[PDB]
Amino acid sequence: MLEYQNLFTRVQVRTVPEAGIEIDESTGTRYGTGTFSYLAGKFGDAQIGPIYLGWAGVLSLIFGFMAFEIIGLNMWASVGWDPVEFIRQLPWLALEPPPPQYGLRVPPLAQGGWYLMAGFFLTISILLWWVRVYRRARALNMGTHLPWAFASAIFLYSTFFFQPLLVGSWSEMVPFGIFPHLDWTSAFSIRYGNLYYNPFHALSIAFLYGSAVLFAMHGATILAVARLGGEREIEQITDRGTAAERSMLFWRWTMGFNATMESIHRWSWWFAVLTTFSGGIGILLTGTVVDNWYLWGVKHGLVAPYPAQNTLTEEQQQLLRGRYQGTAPDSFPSY
């Protein structure tokens, strides 16, 4: 019937598990011996091999588990220590940032202190993981492309710290919670006037879609020439075979231009990195340079005209004026 689409593997080989290339083991070592998963070998490689642990990995795990524990314990306390409510309401629970009136000063423990402590530990854990990735790359004499690709995502993550500090309040930070951080995303877009009109936001959208397009194209291309040996990309890069030639020719005939077996990975790398880089710049400019992105877009000719849906008389213009939101009432009045 249909040809072999190279989507799954029917016949799997088994040998002794790959212990690994010899590396320096003075400040760390490999744990486990390497097992085989039958289900994982159907899709990719079957070996659940040994994992390397060193200084940076251990420290990162300790700090990250501390942050995870703080977040989870605050979530559990928010439902009164009810395990049934803890599981039932888990998507809605959060570890909330401090109140706005404290600015950058230290909040009370139950009103944002735990949040800042967990954020600090998570940041330390992420930086230690970056160090671990760098050391793992340079222990095998590899280039450091993955460390800088990770640094781009770390930059986007750290804008969620730097923008609240630049506007001057920890209350503007992202809460730790499944549904609450989406609530923060929506409210952040609303507060600053329709983040759709942030140009760096649109740029990051373009790079996210471009990443999806590029990975779909590359995966389909490599799977289409996998019967010719195209999945061995290093060989086709150092010694170009007919699979690389056919990929190049397909895309040149389809598009009028093409890449090589090596430079398509440069395209992929740069699209993925530019996603988070442009996103971080866009977040950094919000609330510090521009306070209303729709009005900035109107200024620079980005907003399409529509017919007016309403008109207001002068007394209506004075009446429909409102008030900026203020403090919550701390008293229950009696009338």
Partner: protein
């Protein structure tokens, strides 16, 4: 000034960086199968094809 603001300056700096990056990647794209063959003779688009790149292999 008044019309010029920080977001616009950052956007144009990003545009210049992106165009430079695209030129670099297009140069890297022409490391195989070049120069092009045509009846009129050899052909290269912009950017021009870069210098020959040589790899390093482990000894036997």
């Amino acid at each position: 000034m008044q019309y010029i603001d920080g977001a616009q300056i950052a956007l144009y700096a990003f545009w210049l960086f992106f165009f430079g990056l695209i030129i670099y990647i297009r140069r890297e794209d022409k490391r195989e199968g070049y120069p092009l063959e045509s009846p009129q003779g050899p052909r290269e688009g912009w950017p021009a094809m870069p210098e020959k790149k040589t790899y390093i292999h482990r000894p036997t």
